[PDB]
Amino acid sequence: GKQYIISEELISEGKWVKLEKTTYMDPTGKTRTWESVKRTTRKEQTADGVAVIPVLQRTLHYECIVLVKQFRPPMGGYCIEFPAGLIDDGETPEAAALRELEEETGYKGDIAECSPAVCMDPGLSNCTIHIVTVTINGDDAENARPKPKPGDGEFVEVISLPKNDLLQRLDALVAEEHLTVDARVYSYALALKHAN
Amino acid sequence: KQYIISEELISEGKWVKLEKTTYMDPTGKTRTWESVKRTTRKEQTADGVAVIPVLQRTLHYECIVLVKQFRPPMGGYCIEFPAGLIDDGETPEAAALRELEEETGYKGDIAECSPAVCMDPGLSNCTIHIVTVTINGDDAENARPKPKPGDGEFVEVISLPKNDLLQRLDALVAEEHLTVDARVYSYALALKHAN
């Protein structure tokens, strides 16, 4: 049969992340357990946050994917990721994506498409996001000189990479800089390559 | 310029632990962060692997082999690339082929392998190797794939046309409540965005 959540007991709770004990029934009817992770910041939204796939489009250039580089404490190092952020209450994933993109990179984009809620690491947490594809007219004078404005302690570096050579360019950065590329970013790059 | 200063254990379970991370920001200011780690870490190249299995048969569309299973943290079923932990002394490529065979019964060949990539850098230190594996669906070996599941592992196999992956993923989501993995969806998106 199907599997069902029986109960969810809180183990420990921080200000942002909480650890839980999940009791559930497997197909055979046997009671199993699991140690699940959940954020405390989510309330009544469609997902925790969004990830933005910013496609920089310019008349004189190949399409580029705008990525960001920042220090991630949980990783204890710098990571290369799609721009990403939380969805504000009453805010749509699309609106969150456009704002987040501008805040982190300074680019002003347009919605190309928006995904349903997708899971970040189902074996670990309940964390989900909306993947929002956003196009940026790099030729518009407004996007000629992108000027971001991070919040308090963000410190974000912007890195644009050619769509037609994304994977190789990511590999280079990993070897030279000792960075860690995001799994979504790399999955994206792999498909671009496999499609040719 | 930024680095880790210290880490204080907040709560450790048998599988997962939560801790407070103090680090130095670019200004020289001290800040903290709540980070998640699996209670099992070592001198590996990554925590585990995720396999992108490309089922190839002559005169047929390529298919992407995915797995569907109940995920307690999500409290529901998810669609993911086959995945699992890497064993001691085992290469990422080796764990991929083994993991794929265990979950799908398919015996494939290594196409390429990524460096260690982060699963959710804003939350945890979890990393994996994304391994692209081609499966000769015409070879006798792969005529009748026999999955060899471990205890407590209940995995359903799904093969979707690579040429129409995104749309087929949506069709599944439309049929019933389930969540597509972000890595799988990112892959499906790029297939459409390509040139």
Ligand SMILES: Nc1ncnc2c1[nH]c(=O)n2[C@H]1C[C@H](O)[C@@H](COP(=O)(O)OP(=O)(O)O)O1
């Ligand atoms: N009770 C538990 N609580 C939390 N994590 C657990 C767990 N039991 C358990 O195995 N894990 C870990 C093990 C894995 O890191 C992960 C399960 O996801 P995967 O990698 O697809 O599983 P795999 O195929 O079995 O190796 O959760």
Ligand SMILES: Nc1ncnc2c1[nH]c(=O)n2[C@H]1C[C@H](O)[C@@H](COP(=O)(O)OP(=O)(O)O)O1
């Ligand atoms: N001290 C802390 N510990 C843990 N998580 C934290 C945190 N402070 C904090 O903001 N978070 C959460 C908030 C978010 O879930 C995430 C911050 O990173 P992102 O995804 O890029 O979000 P953004 O900064 O809003 O754009 O971690």
Ligand SMILES: [Mn+2]
């Ligand atoms: Mn951010």
Ligand SMILES: [Mn+2]
């Ligand atoms: Mn934000």
Ligand SMILES: [Mn+2]
């Ligand atoms: Mn941000």
Ligand SMILES: [Mn+2]
């Ligand atoms: Mn698995």
Ligand SMILES: [Mn+2]
């Ligand atoms: Mn497994």
